[PDB]
Amino acid sequence: GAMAPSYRVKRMDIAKNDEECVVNAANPRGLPGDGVCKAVYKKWPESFKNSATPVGTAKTVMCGTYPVIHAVGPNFSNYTESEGDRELAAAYREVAKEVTRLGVNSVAIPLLSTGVYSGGKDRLTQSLNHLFTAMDSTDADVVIYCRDKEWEKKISEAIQMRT
Ligand SMILES: [Cl-]
Ligand SMILES: [Cl-]
Ligand SMILES: [Cl-]
């Protein structure tokens, strides 16, 4: 575990993270996809061997010795708000299990279902709170990666609120 487990946020490409493992915002079919998923595919293409997994689950594939945790959030274009919320919560609980099993002291994580899977809605608070519910009982240093300057401020404020 980390000596004093923390949350941090950085506004940069998760493919250039400084953590002991990465969470991919994956699609269920293990396809190269777009956004975070395409950057992850470019950086760790070996990690996409048998990475396909259902919505609401996470599957880890090693790139050399570096673990890539493929976490499949719901596409809110297809799910009801209620079912989508349940699957989004589940994907993050499966991430917490994998981070614990791997014995890492740190993990880089994007906000699941906040991009092309958002169904056109702002889900920063919804996705971040599900992230907190899952990861609060783990002792890894969590580093959240985002690309928008306003999101970086909003994520930083939500972290500091609990401190
Ligand atoms: Cl960058
Ligand atoms: Cl997304
Ligand atoms: Cl963002």
UniProtKB/Swiss-Prot annotation:
Membrane topology: Peripheral membrane protein
Protein residues bound to ADP-D-ribose: D13, N27, G35, G115, V116, Y117
Effect of N27 to R/Y: Almost complete loss of mono-ADP-ribosylhydrolase activity
Shown stretch of the complete protein: 1334 to 1493 of 2474
Function statement: Seems to be essential for minus-strand RNAs and subgenomic 26S mRNAs synthesis. Displays mono-ADP-ribosylhydrolase activity. ADP-ribosylation is a post-translational modification that controls various processes of the host cell and the virus probably needs to revert it for optimal viral replication. Binds proteins of G3BP family and sequesters them into the viral RNA replication complexes thereby inhibiting the formation of host stress granules on viral mRNAs.
Free-text comment on this protein's domains from its UniProt entry: In the N-terminus, the macro domain displays a mono-ADP-ribosylhydrolase activity. The central part called, the alphavirus unique domain (AUD) has a zinc-binding function. The C-terminus region, also called hypervariable domain (HVD), is mainly disordered and binds several host proteins. This intrinsically disordered domain contains 2 SH3 domain-binding sites and 2 FGDF motifs necessary and sufficient for the formation of nsP3/G3BP complexes.
Domain of life of the source: Viruses
Originating species: Chikungunya virus (strain S27-African prototype) (CHIKV)
Residue ranges of domain Macro in the record: 4-163
Modification(s) after translation: Phosphorylated by host on serines and threonines.
Subunit structure: Interacts with mRNA-capping enzyme nsP1. Interacts (via C-terminus) with host G3BP1; this interaction inhibits the formation of host stress granules on viral mRNAs and the nsp3-G3BP1 complexes bind viral RNAs and probably orchestrate the assembly of viral replication complexes. Interacts (via C-terminus) with host G3BP2; this interaction inhibits the formation of host stress granules on viral mRNAs and the nsp3-G3BP2 complexes bind viral RNAs and probably orchestrate the assembly of viral replication complexes. Interacts (via C-terminus) with host NAP1L1.
Location in or out of the cell: Host cytoplasmic vesicle membrane
Protein name per Swiss-Prot or TrEMBL: Non-structural protein 3
